[PDB]
Each structure stands twice: as structure tokens, then as C-alpha cells.
Amino acid sequence: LGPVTPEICKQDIVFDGIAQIRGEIFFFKDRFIWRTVTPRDKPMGPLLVATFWPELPEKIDAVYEAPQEEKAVFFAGNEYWIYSASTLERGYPKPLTSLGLPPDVQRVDAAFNWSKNKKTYIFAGDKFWRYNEVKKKMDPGFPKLIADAWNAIPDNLDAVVDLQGGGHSYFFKGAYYLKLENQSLKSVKFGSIKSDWLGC
């Protein structure tokens, strides 16, 4: 007798964060992860996030992999953790203020590094920030409003990821994802997370 764990396809799971880390896609839900190497193939899981990142709290809010450093950055509450493989770095968790976020944002929604410009975007409610990974600082003139800067992208995102050299960013909210053409921000298509990411 084991405890009940979430069942993809049989339940409507809205993930906390999604990230491609070291060529693998991770879907995070509470203490668990499912992973796959290519999107429409049914992911292995649930594994426990603790067998890879033991220091992470029981729920993350957003995850991305900083491309250059190939470090995984996880947000949970008003802290973030940066790892190289399963090794937590020097002095993490740090408050979100060490990333350049204002002390008023107490949690973020979704985060990704966008291959279109290799800048990191951090989404929180109706706003986002663009973080410079080489200068290790936020770019000026942020936060901007998602409604003002993105095309057909909803506020309160769940997760965002840009896979590989695929040239699409994927915004996940509720049961659907929006697929953005990185070369044509005008062209946004929608699809179903269960059918297209979880291979249900």
C-alpha cells in the first residue's frame, strides 16, 4: 500500500512549472515530476523532485534553465534556488530581490529563457521582467504588462518553456498551452496539454 499519487491523463493536473533541463522536459506538480525527452511522448513519472533537487520545497512556482550556465533556476515563494546538476550553488536560496525583482513580488508564476534573444522572462500576475543572464541584472524598463507586450498571452500563466532549437515558446495556462512562433509573435496557436505534452 503506497500513497495515492497524481495520474496524468486520468486527472486534470495544472503544473506548477515546466522546464527543459539538460535536454529533458520536466513537468512539476507539488513533490513530483514527470520527464520526457520529446513533447508528445508519454512522460515517465511521477518521480519525486527530491531525488534530484533535495533542497527544493514541496512546490515550486516556475522553473527555467539558464542557457549559458546550464543551471536550473527554481522559484518557490519569494526565494529562488540555482543548481548545477543536483548541486545547489553557493549561497542559494536567495530572496527574489537578489534577481532584481522588487520586494513586493512574493512569488512568480512562470519563467523561461527565450532562445529568440537568450534573455530570461519572469512572469508574475499581469506583469513580467526581462533578466539579462550575461550581465546578471534585469534590463531597464520592466516590469511590463503581459497584455501590453505579448500577443494573445493571458495573465497568470502557469508555466512557460522554449524547447531546444524548436523556435516556439509554449505558454501554459489551465488545460491549454499557447504556441508562439518566436520568429512571428503575431502567430499564436493553441492546443491541449493532455494530448500534446502528456501524450494522452
Residue 11 CB burial class (10 angstroms; 0-12, 13-18, ≥19)? exposed
**x/- contact string, 6-45, with Zn ion (CB under 5 A)?**
-x--------------------------------------
Q: Please tell me whether residue 73 binds Ca ion under the rule CB under 5 A.
A: no
Cβ distance 35 to 24 under 8 Å?
yes
Residue closer to Zn ion, measured from CB, 22 or 42? 42
CB atoms within 10 A of CB 198: 21
Measured in degrees and rounded to the nearest 5, phi and psi for residue 103 equal -70, -5
Expressed in percent and rounded to 5, the helix, strand and coil fractions of the chain are 10, 45, 50
Residue 117 CB burial class (10 angstroms; 0-12, 13-18, ≥19)? exposed
Three-state secondary structure call for residue 24: strand
**x/- contact string, 87-116, with Ca ion (CB under 5 A)?**
----------------------x-------
Residue closer to Na ion, measured from CB, 8 or 162? 162
Q: Please tell me whether residue 17 binds Cl ion under the rule CB under 5 A.
A: yes
Q: Please tell me whether residue 62 binds Cl ion under the rule CB under 5 A.
A: yes
Q: Whose CA is closest to 112, among 8, 1, 20, 27?
A: 20
Whether omega before 3 lies within 30 degrees of 0, making that bond cis, reads no
Q: Which does 158 bind (CB under 5 to 8 A by kind): Na ion, Cl ion, Ca ion, none?
A: Ca ion
CB of 10 to Zn ion, least distance (A): 5
Q: Which residues are annotated as a binding site?
A: 16, 61, 109, 158
CB of 179 to Ca ion, least distance (A): 18
CB of 7 to Zn ion, least distance (A): 5
Q: Please tell me whether residue 110 binds Cl ion under the rule CB under 5 A.
A: yes
Could you say which of 19, 26, 131, 158 contacts Ca ion (CB under 5 A)? 158
Measured in degrees and rounded to the nearest 5, phi and psi for residue 117 equal -150, 5
Residue closer to Na ion, measured from CB, 19 or 180? 19
Q: Write b or e for each residue in 80-100: b if 16 or more Cβ atoms lie within 10 A of its Cβ, otherwise e.
A: bbbbeeeebeeeebeebeebe
Q: Kindly list the residues in this chain that would bind Na ion in the complex (CB under 5 A).
A: 19, 63-64, 112, 161
Q: Kindly list the residues in this chain that would bind Zn ion in the complex (CB under 5 A).
A: 7
Q: Kindly list the residues in this chain that would bind Ca ion in the complex (CB under 5 A).
A: 16-17, 61-62, 109, 158
Q: Kindly list the residues in this chain that would bind Cl ion in the complex (CB under 5 A).
A: 17, 62, 110, 159
